Write an enzyme that holds these catalytic residues in place. Structure first.
Site, PDB file in Angstrom:
ATOM      1  N   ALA A 135       0.850  -1.194   0.000  1.00  0.00           N
ATOM      2  CA  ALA A 135       0.000   0.000   0.000  1.00  0.00           C
ATOM      3  C   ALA A 135       0.891   1.251   0.000  1.00  0.00           C
ATOM      4  O   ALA A 135       0.890   2.012  -0.956  1.00  0.00           O
ATOM      5  CB  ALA A 135      -0.896  -0.011   1.214  1.00  0.00           C
ATOM      6  N   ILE A 155       4.999   2.583   1.222  1.00  0.00           N
ATOM      7  CA  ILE A 155       6.310   2.064   1.584  1.00  0.00           C
ATOM      8  C   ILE A 155       7.260   3.198   1.931  1.00  0.00           C
ATOM      9  O   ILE A 155       7.366   4.185   1.207  1.00  0.00           O
ATOM     10  CB  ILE A 155       6.894   1.224   0.436  1.00  0.00           C
ATOM     11  CG1 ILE A 155       8.261   0.670   0.831  1.00  0.00           C
ATOM     12  CG2 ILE A 155       6.958   2.066  -0.840  1.00  0.00           C
ATOM     13  CD1 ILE A 155       8.733  -0.437  -0.093  1.00  0.00           C
ATOM     14  N   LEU A 156       7.968   3.049   3.041  1.00  0.00           N
ATOM     15  CA  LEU A 156       8.872   4.099   3.470  1.00  0.00           C
ATOM     16  C   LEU A 156      10.172   3.663   4.131  1.00  0.00           C
ATOM     17  O   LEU A 156      10.207   2.712   4.911  1.00  0.00           O
ATOM     18  CB  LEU A 156       8.128   5.030   4.438  1.00  0.00           C
ATOM     19  CG  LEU A 156       8.934   6.108   5.166  1.00  0.00           C
ATOM     20  CD1 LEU A 156       9.246   7.244   4.201  1.00  0.00           C
ATOM     21  CD2 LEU A 156       8.134   6.632   6.371  1.00  0.00           C
ATOM     22  N   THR A 157      11.249   4.362   3.792  1.00  0.00           N
ATOM     23  CA  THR A 157      12.535   4.147   4.438  1.00  0.00           C
ATOM     24  C   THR A 157      12.669   5.464   5.195  1.00  0.00           C
ATOM     25  O   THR A 157      12.566   6.525   4.589  1.00  0.00           O
ATOM     26  CB  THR A 157      13.706   4.050   3.443  1.00  0.00           C
ATOM     27  OG1 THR A 157      13.615   2.834   2.701  1.00  0.00           O
ATOM     28  CG2 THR A 157      15.039   4.070   4.189  1.00  0.00           C
ATOM     29  N   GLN A 210      17.916   6.563   4.339  1.00  0.00           N
ATOM     30  CA  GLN A 210      17.704   6.421   2.901  1.00  0.00           C
ATOM     31  C   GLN A 210      18.995   6.248   2.131  1.00  0.00           C
ATOM     32  O   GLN A 210      20.074   6.559   2.634  1.00  0.00           O
ATOM     33  CB  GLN A 210      16.932   7.627   2.348  1.00  0.00           C
ATOM     34  CG  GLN A 210      15.432   7.582   2.625  1.00  0.00           C
ATOM     35  CD  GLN A 210      14.693   8.812   2.122  1.00  0.00           C
ATOM     36  OE1 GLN A 210      13.477   8.911   2.263  1.00  0.00           O
ATOM     37  NE2 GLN A 210      15.426   9.754   1.538  1.00  0.00           N
ATOM     38  N   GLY A 265      20.156   1.007   0.622  1.00  0.00           N
ATOM     39  CA  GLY A 265      19.717  -0.308   0.187  1.00  0.00           C
ATOM     40  C   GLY A 265      18.539  -0.901   0.940  1.00  0.00           C
ATOM     41  O   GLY A 265      17.981  -1.916   0.535  1.00  0.00           O
ATOM     42  N   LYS A 313      15.265  -1.321  -1.016  1.00  0.00           N
ATOM     43  CA  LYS A 313      15.312  -2.447  -1.931  1.00  0.00           C
ATOM     44  C   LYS A 313      14.960  -3.700  -1.129  1.00  0.00           C
ATOM     45  O   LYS A 313      14.225  -4.560  -1.608  1.00  0.00           O
ATOM     46  CB  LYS A 313      16.715  -2.545  -2.553  1.00  0.00           C
ATOM     47  CG  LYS A 313      16.776  -3.176  -3.937  1.00  0.00           C
ATOM     48  CD  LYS A 313      16.751  -4.697  -3.877  1.00  0.00           C
ATOM     49  CE  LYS A 313      16.970  -5.311  -5.258  1.00  0.00           C
ATOM     50  NZ  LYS A 313      18.295  -4.977  -5.856  1.00  0.00           N
ATOM     51  N   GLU A 360       0.586  -0.543  -4.987  1.00  0.00           N
ATOM     52  CA  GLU A 360      -0.586   0.285  -5.250  1.00  0.00           C
ATOM     53  C   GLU A 360      -0.231   1.515  -6.095  1.00  0.00           C
ATOM     54  O   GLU A 360       0.766   2.197  -5.838  1.00  0.00           O
ATOM     55  CB  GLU A 360      -1.208   0.738  -3.924  1.00  0.00           C
ATOM     56  CG  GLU A 360      -2.452   1.607  -4.068  1.00  0.00           C
ATOM     57  CD  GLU A 360      -2.955   2.139  -2.734  1.00  0.00           C
ATOM     58  OE1 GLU A 360      -2.629   1.539  -1.690  1.00  0.00           O
ATOM     59  OE2 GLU A 360      -3.686   3.152  -2.729  1.00  0.00           O
ATOM     60  N   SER A 395       4.863   7.382  -6.063  1.00  0.00           N
ATOM     61  CA  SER A 395       5.600   8.637  -6.045  1.00  0.00           C
ATOM     62  C   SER A 395       6.794   8.375  -6.955  1.00  0.00           C
ATOM     63  O   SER A 395       7.152   7.219  -7.179  1.00  0.00           O
ATOM     64  CB  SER A 395       6.097   8.948  -4.632  1.00  0.00           C
ATOM     65  OG  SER A 395       7.099   8.024  -4.239  1.00  0.00           O
TER      66      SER A 395
END
Ligand SMILES: CC(C)(COP(=O)(O)OP(=O)(O)OC[C@H]1O[C@@H](n2cnc3c(N)ncnc32)[C@H](O)[C@@H]1OP(=O)(O)O)[C@@H](O)C(=O)NCCC(=O)NCCS
Ligand code: NA
Length: 273
Positions: free
Chosen positions: A142, A144-146, A151, A154, A157, A177, A181
């Site tokens: 839905a 996704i965040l680092t 950041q 890797g 990934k 989804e 971005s």
């Protein structure tokens, strides 16, 4: 009288500047910061308050089941309705780096997969991805965040790869989804490219779409778009396939030289619903 906007969050030793606005239920004052506990994700307008709660007994990792654990990272599966407070706090933090995200308050429809790096200091949340318990479009991710302070290392990934391991274990193809971005789409394209490139060198020189879909849970659409960008789409023995060429071996060796971490499918101890 200064009525300031949230210009920075204090999380551990990091002072982070938000990229977008987030609906934190806080009072607007002459100060422009808030504290975010790197364990509970709870927010505070004063260092003193943050201090009081830092002292109280709490777990030092996400409130979920550890379904993956290797020498580098761990993944925790959290059920929104079972950890509303924590997850609402995660969405509030996430909304600071996403142009758009559903009402942070409503977490019951999602399952959250949080990733942590383990240090001699314990667990450190570095990223996560949410997933609809029930998605009409079969989306396997839905949002996704680092976390920004981690950041370009890797981790993102790793998050994407893990999301695909769930789909494989689930015996379903999946795709993130839409819309994505620019950041997410470029990360996904890199991942889809590295995956097909690794499959062509480590598994078979020529692979049909079904085989790729079966081994990766990638959709026909994402597979074909990726194969075209690399110019590896071809027809052999009666069906569309992707083939190995010099450019691929080259890219592979370059990728490998980067010595990146990956997800070991054997370490995922999990059973789908
Ligand atoms: C999209 C997102 C998850 C990517 O996460 P990330 O942690 O930065 O992802 P990765 O680090 O795996 O991305 C690979 C990049 O890191 C670089 N990198 C990784 N380790 C590195 C190292 N040791 N030295 C130098 N570069 C390194 C790669 O070279 C690559 O650079 P490139 O994209 O120009 O080719 C992140 O930007 C994010 O959370 N953004 C905000 C939320 C968002 O937009 N989400 C998508 C909506 S669905
Ligand atoms: Na997304």
């Amino acid at each position: 009288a200064r009525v300031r906007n949230l210009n920075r969050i204090i999380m551990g030793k990091y002072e982070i500047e938000p990229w977008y606005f987030s609906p934190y239920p806080i009072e607007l004052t002459d100060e422009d910061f808030i504290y975010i506990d790197d364990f509970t994700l709870q927010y505070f307008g004063s260092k003193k308050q943050y201090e009081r709660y830092r002292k109280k007994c709490t777990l030092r990792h996400p409130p979920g089941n550890e379904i993956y654990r290797d020498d580098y990272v761990s993944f925790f599966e959290i059920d929104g309705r079972k950890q509303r407070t924590w997850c609402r706090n995660l969405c509030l933090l996430s909304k600071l780096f996403l142009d758009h995200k559903t009402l942070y308050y409503d977490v019951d429809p999602f399952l959250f997969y949080c990733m942590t790096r383990r240090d001699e200091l314990g667990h450190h949340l570095v990223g996560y991805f949410s997933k609809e318990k029930e998605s009409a479009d079969g989306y396997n991710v839905a949002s996704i965040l680092t976390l920004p302070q981690y950041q370009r290392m890797g981790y993102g990934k790793l998050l994407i790869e893990f999301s695909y391991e769930l789909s494989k274990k689930e015996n379903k193809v999946g795709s993130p989804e839409k819309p994505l971005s620019d950041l997410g789409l470029l990360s996904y394209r890199a991942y889809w490219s590295d995956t097909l490139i690794t499959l062509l060198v480590e598994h078979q020189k020529e692979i049909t779409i079904d085989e790729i879909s079966s081994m990766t849970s990638m959709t026909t659409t994402d597979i074909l778009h990726t194969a075209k960008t690399l110019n590896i789409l071809r027809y052999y023995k009666g069906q569309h396939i992707i083939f190995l060429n010099e450019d691929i071996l080259d890219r592979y060796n370059r990728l490998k030289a980067k010595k990146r971490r990956t997800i070991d499918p054997n370490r995922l101890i999990w059973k789908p619903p």
